Structure formats: C-alpha cells, structure tokens
C-alpha cells in the first residue's frame, strides 16, 4: 500500500483520479487537498465534495490556495455533466497547506504527494516549512510537456497556471515523477472506452460516463511497469514571453546536469483502461 | 490611534521600529509577525523576542515564512546573530503557536477594515496571506512598507534588500490594489544615525536609550564600509514616524512596478516619477523627511520607557 | 530553375549543400555568402573556398559577418573540428573571396533583381538580419527564404535551441518577424537524414571528386554526431534545403505561427512553433515535418555523379 | 586637436553639437554619420544636410542605419522644427556610414574618437561587422543612458531605448567609454535668458541656435516638466574641448535587454557593490557657466 495525499482541482479527469485512488487496494488515500485551477476554488471545492459524496468516499477534503503564488489567475462549474444532489458534507476547518505540512512532519517519511492541478499548495507548504522536504517519499505529478503544451505552444495548463510554484517544486530536490502531455495525450477516451465503463455500470461507471490526464498518476502508483519513463534534467521557465511555464526537459543530456525527474514517455493503454474498469467495479 | 500589525526581520532598525510602535499613544500595536530576511527565521525570531523581553513589551509575537515564495534565499551589515551589540538576559519569552500568515488572515477577516499593515522586511508573509485569502484585500486600510528605491538600490545597483530578497512576493503586494505607502532608500538614507544622534538618546537614557545606543553603535562600522553613508540609517522606524505624523514626510504619488526579470534589475521597484506611462498611481513614494521632527520623535519614544 | 544565394558556415553538411546546389539543373546558384558559425569566419571562409576549388565550382564567394549581431560568440569545434571541416585533403588555395562584403552583395543583388531570388541560409542568420535592417527595401524583393535552423521539439546545442538559432537569436528574431515567406528545415526533419556507413559506401561507389569528398567529409561527423547526440550518423541537415528546392514533394511541411525566444535563460534561441494553432495567430512559416529518405539519398547520388569527369 | 567622427540623428540638440564640433579649434571633425532616431533616416539626413549647408560647414555627410539592429522602430515632425532652411544644394556621400566608419578606423593610427549622440545602430553594426576596429578606437564619448530616471520610460533614456541591443554591443566592447547621461545633461537646461544671450552674439549660428531652442522650450516642459530644452548632445563636444568642466565617476555599467519595465536601462554601479571593474566614465556634474561660455565662443566663430 502506497500512502498518498491527492492534491487536485476538479475537474473532469481529477474526478476519475479521485475515483481510482479512493478504491484501489494498492493506494492508501490519506486525504484530498483542493487548489484553484480548472475553475476558482469555490467551484473546484464543490466539485470535489460532490464526487466524494456521490461515490460515498470517506476521506477528509481540505480547501487550499484560491490563487497562484504570484501571477494573474487564469482558469480552463468546471465539472459539467453529472447531476448532483444538494451537498451534505463540507471542507475540514484546517487549511490544505497546514494539513500537508503537519501530516508530513508527523509522518515516517513514506507519504507520496500526488499533485494533478497547479502547484500552489505544494510550493507554499515547501517554502512555509522546508523541513517537510526529506519527509516526502516522492512526488508523482500531472503537468508539463517535453514537446508541445496545450494552453500555449510551450506550456501545459497546470504549470502555466502557476510557473513560480512549479519552479519551487522542480528545484526542491525531492524525487519527482512527471506525467506530462507527451504521455497523457496517449490516454484518449473515445466513445467505446466510455461504453465499456457504462457496461461495468454501478455509481462509478455512470459517473465516468456523465484524454484522462490525472488518472495516470494513480495508474503509475498502482503499477509503474505500465508506464515507460526516462530520467531527465528538467528546468521550469519563468520568463514572461513565449515560453512562460515551459518545463524544459533535457532528453539527450546535452547540459551534463544530473537528472531530477523521471519523465513519462509511453503508457500501455490496454493495461491502463483495464485498471480503470477494475476500479469502476469496486463501486 | 492607528491599529497596526508590524511585520519585520529584526534586524537593527527593525528593533528601533518595534521600540517606537509599542510606545507611542498614536499607534495601537496589535501584534508582531516575523519573516526571514536580515538573518534566517530561527535568528530573527529570537532577536524579535529579545527586544520585546528587554523593553518589557507585552505584544504577541508570531513566526512566519522562513523562506521567500520562489527564489533562492539570501541574508544581509547586521552580523552573525543579525542584531549584534546589545547583551540580553536569557530569553524566557516565547513565540505564539499560530503561524504568522494565519494570524494576519484571521485578524484582518475578523476586523472592521481599519488595520494598517507595516512590513519592514521582505514581503513573504504578506504575499502568502494575500494569495491564500484574497478576501483580506479590501480589509486592509493601508500598507506602509519599508522597501525599494526610485534611484540606486543598496544590495544591488538596482534593488533594495527587502524587495531583492523576495521580488515575487513584492510583485504580489504592488499589484494588490491596496493603498500603499513606500518608504524607499531615497527617503530612508536621509535618516543617518551619526554619533551625536546616539549620544542624544544615551542622554535620555532608560532601557530604550541604552538599547538604541548598543544596537546603533554596531551599524556604525558596518553601514560605512558597504555604502558610505554618514552612519546607520534607521530605515524601518520611518514607517512608524509616517503613521504618527505624515506631515514630517513628503510623498509623491507614482505608478510603481516591480521587475521580476532575472538579470541586472531583478527586484527593482520601477517608479514613474514624471508620469510618462500614463498609468494611474498605485503608491505614495517617500521623497523627503524632516530629520529634526523625526529625531525628536525618536527621543519622545525613548523617554516613554523611563520607568 | 530557382535562382538562389546560399549563405553558409562550412561546415561538413554545408559542403554537401554547396556540392548539390552548384550541380543540379533545377538550381541557379548565383553566389555563396559566408558567415561565422561552425567555426570563426577566417576558417569557414577557407573551408568554403576549398570546397569550390576541389570541386571546380565557378561561383563567386563573399565573406560576411565574423560575429553575431549582439550576443557573445560561440562555435561548434565539438561537432566540426578544429578547422571547421576536418576530413578531406585540399591543395593550397589558388582562389579567394570577392572584395565586396557579403551583406552589401546580398542587398545590391536583391535590389537589382526582379524579385525571384530565393535566399538559402544554413548557418546563423547574422548576414540576413544585417542586410534586412540595413536595407528594408530588399524585403519584398525576396521570393522566399528556405533556411536550415530551429526545432519544434528538442534542440541540439541546448535542450531548447538548435545551433544556428542559438548562435544568433536576435538575428533570428529579425528574420522570423520579416514577413517574407519562410520555409524552416528544423532538427525534427533533418535528424531523419542520418548518414550511416552504408550511405557513405553508396556515394564512394558512385565515385569521382564529389563522391570522394562526401566520404572524407561525412566520416568525420559520423563519429562526433554519435559522441554528442547519440545519432546513427552525421545528419546532412543543410542539404535538405537544396533538396526542398529541387522537389518540395519529398518533404512534408505544416504551416505554423513561429516565434523566436530572445529571453536569456533556458529557452534562449528557441523557435516556438504553434503546432496546434492555439494562439490564433496567422502562420508565418512552413515547418519541415517529414522527409522521404529514399527520394533524398537518390537525389544526393544524382548530384554526386554530375561531377564524374 | 581631437579627431572625431560625429554620429547623430538630428535633432535639435544634435544640430548644436554639429555647430560646436565643426567650429572649435580643439576638435578635428572628420565626418558626420547619420542614424535613424529622433525621426526616420530620410528626415534626419535632410536635417543634418540643412544644418551644414546653412552654417557653410564643409564636412562629408554619410547616411547609415535606417532601423535598429533588432527591435521595432520608435521615433521621438521634420525632426528639427524651428529654423527655416533654403532649398538643399548638397547631398550625402555614396559610401554607407557603417563602411565609412570601418574603413576610416582601419586606415587610422588609432587616434580617432567616436562621438555617438543618437541610437547606437551604426556603431554596433560596424563593431560586429569588423571587430578589428575595436583597438583602433581611442575612445567613445556618447550621449545616452541615465543612472537615475530615464525620459522615454522611467527606466530608459531615448537613445538607448531606441536600440538596446546595439547599446549592449557598445557597452560590452571593452573600448574606453564616456557616458553623458540624463543625470548630467538635464542640468544644461536652455532657458529664455540663455537663448537671448546667443541672439546677442548673433551671426548665422546665433540665429540658428535661437530658432532651434525656441521650439524645444515648449515640448521639453509638457513632456518632462523641464525649464527649457536641455542641450544633451553638445555636452559630448564640451567634454572633448575641456574635460575639467564635467565631473565623472568611473562605474561598471550594464545594459538591460530584457523586455519588460527596464528594457534599455543602463544599470550603473554607483557604489561598486558588484565588485566588477569599471567600464565607463559616467557624467555626474557640469559647470553650466563654463559650458554656456563655450557655446557662445563657438557661436561667435561663425561671424
Ligand atoms: O480542455 C481543457 N482545458 C483546460 N484544462 C484541461 C482541459 N483538459 C484537461 N485539463 C486539465 O489540465 C490538466 C492538463 O492539461 C489536467 O490535469 C486536466 O485536469
Ligand atoms: O546594509 C544593509 N543590507 C541589507 N539589508 C539591510 C541593510 N541595512 C538595513 N537592512 C535591512 O533591510 C532594509 C534596508 O534596505 C531594512 O528594513 C533593514 O532592516
Ligand atoms: O549536431 C550539431 N550540433 C551543432 N551544430 C551542427 C550539428 N550538425 C550540424 N551542425 C551545423 O549547425 C547547423 C545544424 O544544427 C548546420 O547548419 C551545421 O552546419
Ligand atoms: O524631449 C526629448 N525626448 C526624447 N528625445 C530627445 C528629447 N530631446 C532631445 N532628444 C534626443 O534624445 C537624446 C536624449 O534623450 C538626445 O541625443 C536628443 O537629441
Ligand atoms: Ca486537474
Ligand atoms: Ca528590516
Ligand atoms: Ca551550416
Ligand atoms: Ca540626438
């Protein structure tokens, strides 16, 4: 069992990630922290609460940063589709940043952080209490692209949305795994993938019905052998201009700097969609 | 009475600011938040606690950010402890458990909007609170900060130490839309504390006059070899002076922008003196201070501590 | 026949490009202008002159910019050796650079023209940016620019940047904002043209002075392109520009909005190419995607054999 | 006698610089090179020709760069309103300014000073086109930059802002530099009482000075709040005639080429906090009595 904290901005694929992480026996989901991203924090928080309520997930939810550490905010209800009953659960009182710090400090150094939105909560905690750093076993994140980005030619949305936060994470010295668009764009969810999930049915199959980037991070923790990675020296570009929020990945090793990231190259989509169905079934 | 939260990284002149703010009847000092800067947070916290203990100041002290929001940390001039000179009895005073950033947020949220923030170190605590809880922004009556320079910086030709130590944080503060007053190096360098000014405070005596001497006798050697100023300026204390009586300080309204480009102007406050950009002013920038009024004010506070 | 001015910094693959352009009946090679890049201008000029003398090419050679327009100079001795063209033997030079400066030659020749000359830059863009700014009126006179440079994916010299752009980004920023029709043969395309031992042996078989020069030349970079980037042979990057002019149907291109990054830092000299059109800006460049290597190596051989006596 | 090449974009104060350099026995004016700046090159050229024709100055004029080396062009209406000039009876040489600068320097004995008082496009193009001119240049005395507040932007003085990249080449060239920035040149404000003084000396140069400085009187005040058009460019000529009228301080200077709020800033290390060796003598103060006396002395040489 891998103990995780899932930090997220739901979010359609965030919702799938919550669904998988909460259900698989190889994941111990300690709690969910919410960050503004896909939509404003008031909205992402409600989406996150709704997902857990609908699926009857019993995991503490904590609200975190409603804004990036420095830049002017950008966004993508941020989860249109499924229909939700009136909301009967709320955020914990504790702020997400504090939760992350205290839980890591109290821990034995075996918790993995899994950020799949902009990195505001992670950067604030790291700088607020630098002593958490050797406590983090690993960070498996959804973000970046070694090739073309999405929001801009240069940048993937999660990094573009808080580049300065991303810079802190990438220079933290903690073990990093990056599932970027080069990998996650391979996990396109076509009508017959949806139909397959509908057929499995139950509350998770119906929610899935109403690409799937963030779920690959859970995938990777459940079984790293479905995903090929390559170690690289990665640097985050924080220049204003055409490459703001680019993750510059040194594929060929021409800078002669030691690798700081395992970067996602390819994913076995058969293994992966099998894993999604396996989780949909647990519900 | 102006309610303030004093955010600081003591620090020699920070200690002078603490001394003034805590004593003057025109200032209601709600609490002191500490930020890393002049020295690491472990050290600035102790220096802050030591000042308050020595002067028997009864105000809650909160530890905040031990690092800037993005850049690689730098420290200052102020020595190994960051407050060399005075000798302090063992510290029996302790920091609050609540983190400074939470303290700032909750206090502002609970308030009626008339608390002024007075940051005189790097702006890490301020930027984290503003982004953590954006709703504090209309609650802040004004920010009166020590930082920046429209002319020459000190740490680099372009940048003053407080801004240079966390430019990104500074950019957050300067784009917040909250009323800002900036006491930059252009103003604060006029407040050089020469041997006669020290001798004057020694003469007033008591615990605050002795501390003033011990502290400011150290930054006599150390502000000369670095910048060639007639003595240690008392930068941070001008913020308290501004609140006590704004008429002793001439300000000019300007459009101000913080440069976060890596390179020769990283952490520069770019001030539009002449209005060439056609942008509305966002800052009242310190131009000149009446040093006679000001040193008189310093003495007046020093004397409030004679038992 | 496409009239061209070939601007280059020879350079191993530059020499292959000179060999092809001078010989193919579909190309009218008006002149060769030289720029510092691969090596310093003193060296790239000699390498240029040696190639033409060896192959008995009768085309005026002009020396241009010995330095980039703004940045601190860099070379590629690592890829191209101490001389900038290690490999072949050359007899002492019995020819020399024209007296006219390359930049003036480019300007006057374009001004005097009927607007049908194509520029073919395959080194840093110093000569092209200086002419464009020195005489803005040349701009409508340029039919097209077909350049070797950039990369929409990974660069070579840095993770972000390909050498020709990296060596003068500001010059590049001039070219890419010029409004002249651009074709960019970047590393994404040109890395597909690796020259393995079998390709070399093919050209050796065709023989004559161009086949021998090809062999002497591409054996050097065979090993440096393997030591530095892990490539299977030394690509013939620059020759793809000539190839494109001889027959554009061997090369697949996609129109894109392209922008050169002049920020100091990790993306200095990156060509940022908007593959998916997310910026809603009109395309300014045809970007090389794929090359038919069978067509291309056949074309190389066809040129090599035009030199057998 | 100091041999000079005067590189300029006339320009009201450029014209005063042309007037002084051409007349003073301590200056040997070899030629005038023109750059786009104040106005487009077609305009700055004509202005430069008109000044020499009116004052009967017999010095070759050469047209140079019509555009900066990289950025989008900016200007500061003919570029020299005020004086009335007859129809032009002279023309520019045929040699391009950049080639002129290179050949003249290469042929020289290393005794020529360059005096740039517009954007640095001609200088940066020559330096990079023929790096061998560098040890040949005795000194560069330029009007440009500001260690304090700029004019065109809070950070940048016009000449640098108009071609920062060209400026970065000049400042990293290793050639001896003297910089007459706005911090110095703003002290040389030309008020109605200074104009009336030159009117009184009279002749063709006194009349031109009046017609010219009357225009800038209005447009310096509305734009920068100044008491009357400073005479920026003429200070470089002043500095060569007699350096003792001007106090300088040696500083490490760096040009900022970042896009953003400090594009085209000269960053001057006043206090030496970087620990880098100085590369520039920066103008601090000027004796305005000495200086105006010198202007009059030159105005008088034209009777
Ligand atoms: O179309 C979209 N617009 C904006 N954001 C998206 C879209 N699709 C996915 N994401 C969100 O951005 C991250 C990586 O791009 C993913 O984690 C996903 O939640
Ligand atoms: O010489 C110095 N170097 C760096 N920081 C300093 C120095 N003197 C004081 N401070 C601290 O930084 C701000 C002044 O710019 C002041 O807040 C002071 O506390
Ligand atoms: O692998 C390389 N690294 C750097 N420069 C190279 C390499 N191969 C060729 N060239 C030289 O630089 C340009 C293409 O990048 C080509 O124009 C060539 O002359
Ligand atoms: O008011 C003005 N705005 C902009 N440029 C000016 C002005 N007056 C003169 N110059 C031109 O710009 C340079 C220094 O700013 C001087 O060389 C001058 O010729
Ligand atoms: Ca997400
Ligand atoms: Ca302080
Ligand atoms: Ca080449
Ligand atoms: Ca001028």
Short mmCIF file of C-alpha atoms in Angstrom, two decimals, chain D residues 180-288:
data_model
loop_
_atom_site.label_atom_id
_atom_site.label_comp_id
_atom_site.label_asym_id
_atom_site.label_seq_id
_atom_site.Cartn_x
_atom_site.Cartn_y
_atom_site.Cartn_z
CA UNK D 180 26.92 61.74 -20.79
CA UNK D 181 23.59 60.56 -19.30
CA UNK D 182 20.38 62.48 -18.46
CA UNK D 183 21.67 62.91 -14.85
CA UNK D 184 24.27 65.28 -16.31
CA UNK D 185 22.59 66.63 -19.45
CA UNK D 186 19.34 67.62 -17.67
CA UNK D 187 21.50 70.20 -15.80
CA UNK D 188 22.06 72.03 -19.14
CA UNK D 189 18.52 73.48 -19.49
CA UNK D 190 18.27 76.21 -22.11
CA UNK D 191 16.04 78.92 -20.65
CA UNK D 192 14.87 82.16 -22.46
CA UNK D 193 17.83 84.07 -20.89
CA UNK D 194 20.37 81.61 -22.48
CA UNK D 195 18.70 81.93 -25.88
CA UNK D 196 18.70 85.76 -25.69
CA UNK D 197 22.42 85.60 -24.93
CA UNK D 198 23.14 83.69 -28.13
CA UNK D 199 20.82 86.01 -30.15
CA UNK D 200 23.03 88.85 -28.88
CA UNK D 201 26.21 87.18 -30.14
CA UNK D 202 24.27 86.90 -33.45
CA UNK D 203 25.56 85.70 -36.85
CA UNK D 204 24.28 82.54 -38.58
CA UNK D 205 24.99 80.21 -35.58
CA UNK D 206 23.40 82.53 -33.01
CA UNK D 207 20.26 82.83 -35.16
CA UNK D 208 20.05 79.07 -35.75
CA UNK D 209 20.51 78.47 -32.00
CA UNK D 210 17.57 80.78 -31.33
CA UNK D 211 15.22 79.32 -33.97
CA UNK D 212 16.02 75.78 -32.73
CA UNK D 213 15.94 76.22 -28.96
CA UNK D 214 12.71 78.14 -29.07
CA UNK D 215 10.86 75.08 -30.38
CA UNK D 216 12.17 72.59 -27.71
CA UNK D 217 11.40 75.12 -24.96
CA UNK D 218 7.68 74.13 -25.17
CA UNK D 219 7.97 70.35 -25.80
CA UNK D 220 10.59 69.69 -23.07
CA UNK D 221 8.23 71.29 -20.46
CA UNK D 222 4.98 69.46 -21.48
CA UNK D 223 6.76 66.06 -21.63
CA UNK D 224 9.34 66.01 -18.80
CA UNK D 225 8.44 69.18 -16.79
CA UNK D 226 11.89 70.72 -17.59
CA UNK D 227 12.52 74.54 -17.53
CA UNK D 228 13.68 74.59 -21.20
CA UNK D 229 15.05 72.04 -23.67
CA UNK D 230 18.32 70.70 -22.24
CA UNK D 231 21.18 70.61 -24.77
CA UNK D 232 22.17 66.96 -24.29
CA UNK D 233 24.37 66.17 -27.27
CA UNK D 234 26.52 69.34 -27.17
CA UNK D 235 27.97 68.14 -23.76
CA UNK D 236 29.95 65.47 -25.58
CA UNK D 237 31.69 68.20 -27.61
CA UNK D 238 32.12 70.22 -24.42
CA UNK D 239 33.73 67.22 -22.74
CA UNK D 240 36.30 66.93 -25.53
CA UNK D 241 37.15 70.61 -25.66
CA UNK D 242 37.77 70.55 -21.85
CA UNK D 243 37.03 67.55 -19.61
CA UNK D 244 37.51 69.67 -16.45
CA UNK D 245 34.14 71.38 -16.93
CA UNK D 246 32.48 67.99 -16.30
CA UNK D 247 32.83 65.72 -13.21
CA UNK D 248 32.77 61.99 -13.99
CA UNK D 249 32.77 58.87 -11.88
CA UNK D 250 34.03 55.53 -13.10
CA UNK D 251 31.39 52.76 -12.86
CA UNK D 252 30.66 49.23 -14.01
CA UNK D 253 27.75 49.79 -16.45
CA UNK D 254 25.42 47.08 -17.82
CA UNK D 255 22.68 47.48 -20.46
CA UNK D 256 19.39 45.66 -19.70
CA UNK D 257 17.95 43.96 -22.85
CA UNK D 258 15.08 42.22 -21.00
CA UNK D 259 11.64 43.00 -22.46
CA UNK D 260 9.66 44.49 -19.56
CA UNK D 261 9.90 47.59 -17.31
CA UNK D 262 13.72 48.08 -17.62
CA UNK D 263 14.22 47.43 -21.38
CA UNK D 264 17.03 49.75 -22.44
CA UNK D 265 18.13 50.68 -18.91
CA UNK D 266 21.83 51.45 -18.35
CA UNK D 267 22.39 49.93 -14.93
CA UNK D 268 25.23 51.90 -13.31
CA UNK D 269 27.01 50.56 -10.22
CA UNK D 270 27.45 53.82 -8.31
CA UNK D 271 28.66 52.25 -5.09
CA UNK D 272 30.68 49.40 -6.61
CA UNK D 273 28.63 46.66 -4.87
CA UNK D 274 29.08 44.12 -7.71
CA UNK D 275 32.91 44.06 -7.41
CA UNK D 276 33.29 44.31 -11.18
CA UNK D 277 35.87 46.62 -12.77
CA UNK D 278 34.53 49.92 -14.22
CA UNK D 279 33.96 50.11 -17.95
CA UNK D 280 32.55 53.66 -18.21
CA UNK D 281 33.23 57.21 -17.06
CA UNK D 282 29.74 58.40 -16.11
CA UNK D 283 28.74 62.12 -16.22
CA UNK D 284 27.88 63.41 -12.71
CA UNK D 285 28.02 67.26 -12.81
CA UNK D 286 28.65 70.02 -15.32
CA UNK D 287 29.79 73.62 -14.77
CA UNK D 288 26.98 75.50 -16.61
#
